[PDB]
Design a protein around this ligand. Sequence first.
Ligand SMILES: [Mg+2]
Ligand SMILES: [Mg+2]
Ligand SMILES: [Mg+2]
Ligand SMILES: [Mg+2]
Ligand SMILES: [Mg+2]
Ligand SMILES: [Mg+2]
Ligand SMILES: [Mg+2]
Ligand SMILES: [Mg+2]
Ligand SMILES: [Mg+2]
Ligand SMILES: [Mg+2]
Ligand SMILES: [Mg+2]
Ligand SMILES: [Mg+2]
Ligand SMILES: [Mg+2]
Ligand SMILES: [Mg+2]
Ligand SMILES: [Mg+2]
Ligand SMILES: [Mg+2]
Ligand SMILES: [Mg+2]
Ligand SMILES: [Mg+2]
Ligand SMILES: [Mg+2]
Ligand SMILES: [Mg+2]
Ligand SMILES: [Mg+2]
Ligand SMILES: [Mg+2]
Ligand SMILES: [Mg+2]
Ligand SMILES: [Mg+2]
Ligand SMILES: [Mg+2]
Ligand SMILES: [Mg+2]
Ligand SMILES: [Mg+2]
Ligand SMILES: [Mg+2]
Ligand SMILES: [Mg+2]
Ligand SMILES: [Mg+2]
Ligand SMILES: [Mg+2]
Ligand SMILES: [Mg+2]
Ligand SMILES: [Mg+2]
Ligand SMILES: [Mg+2]
Ligand SMILES: [Mg+2]
Ligand SMILES: [Mg+2]
Ligand SMILES: [Mg+2]
Ligand SMILES: [Mg+2]
Ligand SMILES: [Mg+2]
Ligand SMILES: [Mg+2]
Ligand SMILES: [Mg+2]
Ligand SMILES: [Mg+2]
Ligand SMILES: [Mg+2]
Ligand SMILES: [Mg+2]
Ligand SMILES: [Mg+2]
Ligand SMILES: [Mg+2]
Ligand SMILES: [Mg+2]
Ligand SMILES: [Mg+2]
Ligand SMILES: [Mg+2]
Ligand SMILES: [Mg+2]
Ligand SMILES: [Mg+2]
Ligand SMILES: [Mg+2]
Ligand SMILES: [Mg+2]
Ligand SMILES: [Mg+2]
Ligand SMILES: [Mg+2]
Ligand SMILES: [Mg+2]
Ligand SMILES: [Mg+2]
Ligand SMILES: [Mg+2]
Ligand SMILES: [Mg+2]
Ligand SMILES: [Mg+2]
Ligand SMILES: [Mg+2]
Ligand SMILES: [Mg+2]
Ligand SMILES: [Mg+2]
Ligand SMILES: [Mg+2]
Ligand SMILES: [Mg+2]
Ligand SMILES: [Mg+2]
Ligand SMILES: [Mg+2]
Ligand SMILES: [Mg+2]
Ligand SMILES: [Mg+2]
Ligand SMILES: [Mg+2]
Ligand SMILES: [Mg+2]
Ligand SMILES: [Mg+2]
Ligand SMILES: [Mg+2]
Ligand SMILES: [Mg+2]
Ligand SMILES: [Mg+2]
Ligand SMILES: [Mg+2]
Ligand SMILES: [Mg+2]
Ligand SMILES: [Mg+2]
Ligand SMILES: [Mg+2]
Ligand SMILES: [Mg+2]
Ligand SMILES: [Mg+2]
Ligand SMILES: [Mg+2]
Ligand SMILES: [Mg+2]
Ligand SMILES: [Mg+2]
Ligand SMILES: [Mg+2]
Ligand SMILES: [Mg+2]
Ligand SMILES: [Mg+2]
Ligand SMILES: [Mg+2]
Ligand SMILES: [Mg+2]
Ligand SMILES: [Mg+2]
Ligand SMILES: [Mg+2]
Ligand SMILES: [Mg+2]
Ligand SMILES: [Mg+2]
Ligand SMILES: [Mg+2]
Ligand SMILES: [Mg+2]
Ligand SMILES: [Mg+2]
Ligand SMILES: [Mg+2]
Ligand SMILES: [Mg+2]
Ligand SMILES: [Zn+2]
Lengths: 59, 50
Amino acid sequence: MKVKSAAKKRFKLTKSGQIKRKHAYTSHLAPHKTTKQKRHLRKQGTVSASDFKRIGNLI
Amino acid sequence: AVKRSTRLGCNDCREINYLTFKNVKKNPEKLALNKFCSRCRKVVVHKEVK
RNA sequence: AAUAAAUAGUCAAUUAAAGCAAUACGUGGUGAAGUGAAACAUCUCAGUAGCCACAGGAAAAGAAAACGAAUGUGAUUCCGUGUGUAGUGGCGAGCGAAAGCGGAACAGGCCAAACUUAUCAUUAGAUAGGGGUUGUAGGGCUUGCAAUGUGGACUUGAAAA
RNA sequence: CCUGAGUAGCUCGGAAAACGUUAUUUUGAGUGAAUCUGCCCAGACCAUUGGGUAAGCCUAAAUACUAAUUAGUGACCGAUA
RNA sequence: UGUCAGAGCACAUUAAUGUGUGAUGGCGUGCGUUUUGAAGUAUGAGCCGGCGAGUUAUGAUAGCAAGCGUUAGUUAACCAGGAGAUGGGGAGCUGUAGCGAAAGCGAGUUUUAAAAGAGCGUUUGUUUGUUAUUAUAGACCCGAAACGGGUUGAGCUAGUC
RNA sequence: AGGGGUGAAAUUCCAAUCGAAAUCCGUGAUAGCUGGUUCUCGUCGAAAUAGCUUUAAGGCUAGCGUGAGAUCACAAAUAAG
RNA sequence: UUCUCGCAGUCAGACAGUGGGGGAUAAGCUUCAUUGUCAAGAGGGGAAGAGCCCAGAUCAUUAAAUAAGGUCCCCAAAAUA
RNA sequence: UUGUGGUAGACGAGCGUUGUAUUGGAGUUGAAGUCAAAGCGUGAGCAUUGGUGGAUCCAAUACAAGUGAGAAUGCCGGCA
RNA sequence: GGACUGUUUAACUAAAACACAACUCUAUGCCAAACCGUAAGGUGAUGUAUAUGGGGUGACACCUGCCCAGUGCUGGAAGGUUAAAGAAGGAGGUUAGCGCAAGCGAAGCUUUUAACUGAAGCCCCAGUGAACGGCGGCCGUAACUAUAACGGUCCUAAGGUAGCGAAAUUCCUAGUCGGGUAAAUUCCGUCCCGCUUGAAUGGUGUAACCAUCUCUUGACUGUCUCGGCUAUAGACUCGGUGAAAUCCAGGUACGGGUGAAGACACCCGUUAGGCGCAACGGGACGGAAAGACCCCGUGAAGCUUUACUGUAGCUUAAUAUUG
RNA sequence: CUACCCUUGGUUGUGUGCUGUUCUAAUUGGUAACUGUUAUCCAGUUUCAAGACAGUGUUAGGUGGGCAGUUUGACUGGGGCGGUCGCCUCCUAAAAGGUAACGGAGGCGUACAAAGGUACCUUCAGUACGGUUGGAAAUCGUAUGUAGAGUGUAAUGGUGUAAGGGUGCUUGACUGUGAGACAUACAGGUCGAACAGGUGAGAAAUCAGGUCAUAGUGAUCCGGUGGUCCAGUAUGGAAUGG
Ligand SMILES: [Mg+2]
Ligand SMILES: [Mg+2]
Ligand SMILES: [Mg+2]
Ligand SMILES: [Mg+2]
Ligand SMILES: [Mg+2]
Ligand SMILES: [Mg+2]
Ligand SMILES: [Mg+2]
Ligand SMILES: [Mg+2]
Ligand SMILES: [Mg+2]
Ligand SMILES: [Mg+2]
Ligand SMILES: [Mg+2]
Ligand SMILES: [Mg+2]
Ligand SMILES: [Mg+2]
Ligand SMILES: [Mg+2]
Ligand SMILES: [Mg+2]
Ligand SMILES: [Mg+2]
Ligand SMILES: [Mg+2]
Ligand SMILES: [Mg+2]
Ligand SMILES: [Mg+2]
Ligand SMILES: [Mg+2]
Ligand SMILES: [Mg+2]
Ligand SMILES: [Mg+2]
Ligand SMILES: [Mg+2]
Ligand SMILES: [Mg+2]
Ligand SMILES: [Mg+2]
Ligand SMILES: [Mg+2]
Ligand SMILES: [Mg+2]
Ligand SMILES: [Mg+2]
Ligand SMILES: [Mg+2]
Ligand SMILES: [Mg+2]
Ligand SMILES: [Mg+2]
Ligand SMILES: [Mg+2]
Ligand SMILES: [Mg+2]
Ligand SMILES: [Mg+2]
Ligand SMILES: [Mg+2]
Ligand SMILES: [Mg+2]
Ligand SMILES: [Mg+2]
Ligand SMILES: [Mg+2]
Ligand SMILES: [Mg+2]
Ligand SMILES: [Mg+2]
Ligand SMILES: [Mg+2]
Ligand SMILES: [Mg+2]
Ligand SMILES: [Mg+2]
Ligand SMILES: [Mg+2]
Ligand SMILES: [Mg+2]
Ligand SMILES: [Mg+2]
Ligand SMILES: [Mg+2]
Ligand SMILES: [Mg+2]
Ligand SMILES: [Mg+2]
Ligand SMILES: [Mg+2]
Ligand SMILES: [Mg+2]
Ligand SMILES: [Mg+2]
Ligand SMILES: [Mg+2]
Ligand SMILES: [Mg+2]
Ligand SMILES: [Mg+2]
Ligand SMILES: [Mg+2]
Ligand SMILES: [Mg+2]
Ligand SMILES: [Mg+2]
Ligand SMILES: [Mg+2]
Ligand SMILES: [Mg+2]
Ligand SMILES: [Mg+2]
Ligand SMILES: [Mg+2]
Ligand SMILES: [Mg+2]
Ligand SMILES: [Mg+2]
Ligand SMILES: [Mg+2]
Ligand SMILES: [Mg+2]
Ligand SMILES: [Mg+2]
Ligand SMILES: [Mg+2]
Ligand SMILES: [Mg+2]
Ligand SMILES: [Mg+2]
Ligand SMILES: [Mg+2]
Ligand SMILES: [Mg+2]
Ligand SMILES: [Mg+2]
Ligand SMILES: [Mg+2]
Ligand SMILES: [Mg+2]
Ligand SMILES: [Mg+2]
Ligand SMILES: [Mg+2]
Ligand SMILES: [Mg+2]
Ligand SMILES: [Mg+2]
Ligand SMILES: [Mg+2]
Ligand SMILES: [Mg+2]
Ligand SMILES: [Mg+2]
Ligand SMILES: [Mg+2]
Ligand SMILES: [Mg+2]
Ligand SMILES: [Mg+2]
Ligand SMILES: [Mg+2]
Ligand SMILES: [Mg+2]
Ligand SMILES: [Mg+2]
Ligand SMILES: [Mg+2]
Ligand SMILES: [Mg+2]
Ligand SMILES: [Mg+2]
Ligand SMILES: [Mg+2]
Ligand SMILES: [Mg+2]
Ligand SMILES: [Mg+2]
Ligand SMILES: [Mg+2]
Ligand SMILES: [Mg+2]
Ligand SMILES: [Mg+2]
Ligand SMILES: [Mg+2]
Ligand SMILES: [Zn+2]
């Protein structure tokens, strides 16, 4: 099996197996979002349980 | 969509630190507000930047 | 022969080539499409199938104008790992090494040019020999010492297993 | 004194390499160098440092395969196999 | 078109409230498929016998079990050995320290002027055997109209000579 | 002589076949579509819903099932206030 | 019926009562909310009926009491006023 | 004591076929096959006897599968 | 309707379709245009504008009207825009060097940009219809009514001319009228608001011809009123050989109802001794063909175009052969 | 008088191409002749005709269904046609929330340097009466009136000492964050206490992380711009990235 080249470059793993990710809606069209929204989307997050199983076998 | 947004940049480090809205048709004069600057860590004049 | 010479052409003698197959391996030229991307054109399929040419008992490759970042390795080939890593991708489907390390085997040789010899209406810029084969540069020019060996990818024979 | 020239480079279209063309390799068209204080390379490029000697040739072994000859084997088949 | 009761008839056994037939009474619209719903005026099979569809190779995850264990665990290629178990082979792979895009720091680290706050960490291993699922391969079996590449056909027929 | 031929032209004819022969090969093409998938017993036992989908006969996640483990009460059910 | 992990199937539903939308207070119509059954559930009543009523089949018994429903005959079971 | 309708599906426990490895055993005084019968099991299934048959087969514990046919307008053979 | 004789879908369409003699347009000066191939080579043609290729129409007779706006084709002065390529220069990277730093900075190479030159084509200007094609409305108006010769106005490139017309064309429409008949959605002639006829995708006539279409009529007849008879070969019976599709197992009634909504099989009734033979087709949603119609599939194939992306060919320029 | 820099013209002179001639030796010929050769091809030698043209190779424009590979959506009381596809408000929606139909009505893809923030002051529309232009209705005074007024907007909800109107000062329409919740398949969305920095209003308490609230919006990839305490393929830069 080959690791998907798109699964990597977008999902980093951690010590306990959580898959770190970046928030979307942070590429353009900045004036259409509030500074609260922008500063909340700047921080990183983890995949939800609904996607953890699908990303585990993808990596 | 229409583009009524404008950028406000500091006048000491010449850094752009704010994104606001402006009506070019109604308001003809450039904005000259005074806002907080992350670099200078103080309040300083921010002017409209193209 | 045209056309004087000379070539084209014609004839004779000698030596090789033709072809086949092993439903298999090698090299080179040419080279798709079904399919996947849940459509499709970049892409994939795939340099695969097929077509053709040349072999050989294997073929191909091969002795650094190299790897590559070090007080480093020192032809080519094949196996494991490095790793599904660095990367490359309408960054989509996908594709995917080169170093290094551990192993199988191990082998390095030879021409051109200089310089020189002999001969060609010697206009040689040509033929046949000696000299040379490189990188911590080599060789030639002139002048000496030490050498008669060790080893080959090497010919004929004889003997033995 | 000699050390491989329409050659290495460069431009225009392609390709090989994992790479969808790009440092390295190759070429259809055009142009075109230098000679150990020389030339090429270390992913655009320049300088320092270092590595290597292109444009000539040959090369056993480990590697790939079994139509065939001899011996033999099979938790392979036993006439719809 | 059978089943539960049931006379009469004829026999005698894997000795068993026995076996063969069944006047008569009660009840009773097949089997698979696909559908909300099939006795089906939907579908598939005339009958019998044989054959006929979840595999293999390489990896990932999880359950169960065994070996070895806290500076652990385990070898791949290859060599010897019976086409062996195995011995040599520690190249490597997983775990042992994490955080950050990265230089970097380190039981801390990223963000930030911040040590405040927040995110991630401040521990529970490895190699095999078996089972389940999954990825690449044709991947449970059968079925297209098609597409591309090569060859064979003008003895029928159409044209021309 | 077949992404070709021939056609006083009809999509005619090209070996009882022609909107583009016959045969072999890529090939076991692909099919979200039909059909089929073979021994037994025991425990438990659904859904036909929401969102997205060039999606509507398909797919992913959530909802409902099953196996293992944890949570004993503060968790979840049945009645009264 | 909450939390974690492994494996799913399901995305065509149907009817009856109740409250509505579309239709015409038509449809065994179509689209919702809710209570039930069928789907995936036999038995008894409805003469015959997937969805209505009574209920939930472990096997055997030629035992007894009952639910819906019924007691002239078919067909088990009644009499008084 | 509470239970035991059941499709898709999940989980658990078993039967049967062929062969191999270890043990033991039967067989021309008759093995497999094959037919019949009034047997034993909760189920796959398992025996006993007799006829035919003429040379291999059985039991236990493990292991490996081309391992289970009623349907595919399924293929082949035979017969209605 | 086609001029004709002919040709055509082997195996459902022989015709009004194709072809044909004839007309016209266009290209072609010969190594001709066109065509097969990749090229050689070849057809055209051992021909030479009275010749060859292609488009359209289809004897013969009379005619073929208007529009060059759009598209196509041909030609054109200059002018504007435009590729490759060449090219004056410009901007950076590096560092010899200058400078306390900072910074500046020669040549060499190297990255990139570039005025300007640069054909055809396009924009633009004319011609071209037997080239692709197109060729209108509204309002008022004459001394009975009716209608409008006539006048006004909008738009277009120009608004359909002749001829023919309820047509193989007419929706309304079985249009009105006349003829044919006792009676005529068909037929013949005529009328014209021709929704939407019309002049080389030709218009209108036309003698002869047609296994063409359509209507009336004489003779003629079993086409019919209306059915009947005869003879053979079958069918039927006997002797011999001996299939076929179909088929879950069958011992296979009718009426009303029910049910997946049209029952041999279910519920309630009625009828019916067992089994053949000859008949005829009501049913078994009878048999044969995994519906050709409809829909679905991110199915296939053929064809079309100013759908997209490409490409053979044709044409223009730079460069090499190239003075 | 001696020098440098602009507009324009002539001159001997070189450097480039641009159209225009002439020439032949490259090259071409399906002109003719001879020879190989008993030979229509081919080759050689001429002759004639062209001629640096043409043809051919490479590069680059134009035309090009002649040819090829594909695309040409979904919902739908069957399809085609018509209509719609995202977000917001009300009803259907059955007094928590949620709930469909090609059911019934409407809007949005913004606006405001003030319509934001703060401090202070202040409170309808309409109607009645009285008054030049002036009129049914402009403005003034008094009274009445409990929202029919305003709150930028489509509706709903809210709000009459408010969230409506006016004035003064300002830019919090801040920086780094963020415990805890709402709603959700995911992706995303919504509210937010509180902390640190530095500000605005106000005497202070306090308020200010855009508006009375709900529509005013688009993921990823790719490339561009500004800043930068990161990388810079031997080293120093640069290129190129983060
Ligand atoms: Mg393809
Ligand atoms: Mg595809
Ligand atoms: Mg697909
Ligand atoms: Mg060799
Ligand atoms: Mg180079
Ligand atoms: Mg490649
Ligand atoms: Mg050197
Ligand atoms: Mg470098
Ligand atoms: Mg050299
Ligand atoms: Mg055989
Ligand atoms: Mg046989
Ligand atoms: Mg009975
Ligand atoms: Mg019955
Ligand atoms: Mg079955
Ligand atoms: Mg059905
Ligand atoms: Mg149905
Ligand atoms: Mg029936
Ligand atoms: Mg049917
Ligand atoms: Mg079917
Ligand atoms: Mg059948
Ligand atoms: Mg069978
Ligand atoms: Mg395991
Ligand atoms: Mg070992
Ligand atoms: Mg912390
Ligand atoms: Mg362990
Ligand atoms: Mg013939
Ligand atoms: Mg094709
Ligand atoms: Mg046709
Ligand atoms: Mg035929
Ligand atoms: Mg198949
Ligand atoms: Mg498909
Ligand atoms: Mg149960
Ligand atoms: Mg349900
Ligand atoms: Mg529901
Ligand atoms: Mg589907
Ligand atoms: Mg699910
Ligand atoms: Mg429903
Ligand atoms: Mg529904
Ligand atoms: Mg209802
Ligand atoms: Mg209603
Ligand atoms: Mg209703
Ligand atoms: Mg219904
Ligand atoms: Mg079902
Ligand atoms: Mg029932
Ligand atoms: Mg009943
Ligand atoms: Mg029970
Ligand atoms: Mg009782
Ligand atoms: Mg009772
Ligand atoms: Mg009784
Ligand atoms: Mg059960
Ligand atoms: Mg056995
Ligand atoms: Mg026996
Ligand atoms: Mg089998
Ligand atoms: Mg005719
Ligand atoms: Mg004729
Ligand atoms: Mg015919
Ligand atoms: Mg005929
Ligand atoms: Mg030619
Ligand atoms: Mg000729
Ligand atoms: Mg004609
Ligand atoms: Mg005509
Ligand atoms: Mg005309
Ligand atoms: Mg004109
Ligand atoms: Mg022109
Ligand atoms: Mg007229
Ligand atoms: Mg007339
Ligand atoms: Mg007529
Ligand atoms: Mg009449
Ligand atoms: Mg008629
Ligand atoms: Mg008439
Ligand atoms: Mg016409
Ligand atoms: Mg015409
Ligand atoms: Mg006429
Ligand atoms: Mg005829
Ligand atoms: Mg007879
Ligand atoms: Mg007979
Ligand atoms: Mg009924
Ligand atoms: Mg069908
Ligand atoms: Mg398609
Ligand atoms: Mg396709
Ligand atoms: Mg040219
Ligand atoms: Mg010739
Ligand atoms: Mg030329
Ligand atoms: Mg071109
Ligand atoms: Mg095109
Ligand atoms: Mg096409
Ligand atoms: Mg394709
Ligand atoms: Mg549709
Ligand atoms: Mg419809
Ligand atoms: Mg309908
Ligand atoms: Mg539409
Ligand atoms: Mg509510
Ligand atoms: Mg409610
Ligand atoms: Mg409002
Ligand atoms: Mg204010
Ligand atoms: Mg306000
Ligand atoms: Mg892109
Ligand atoms: Mg560097
Ligand atoms: Zn600043």
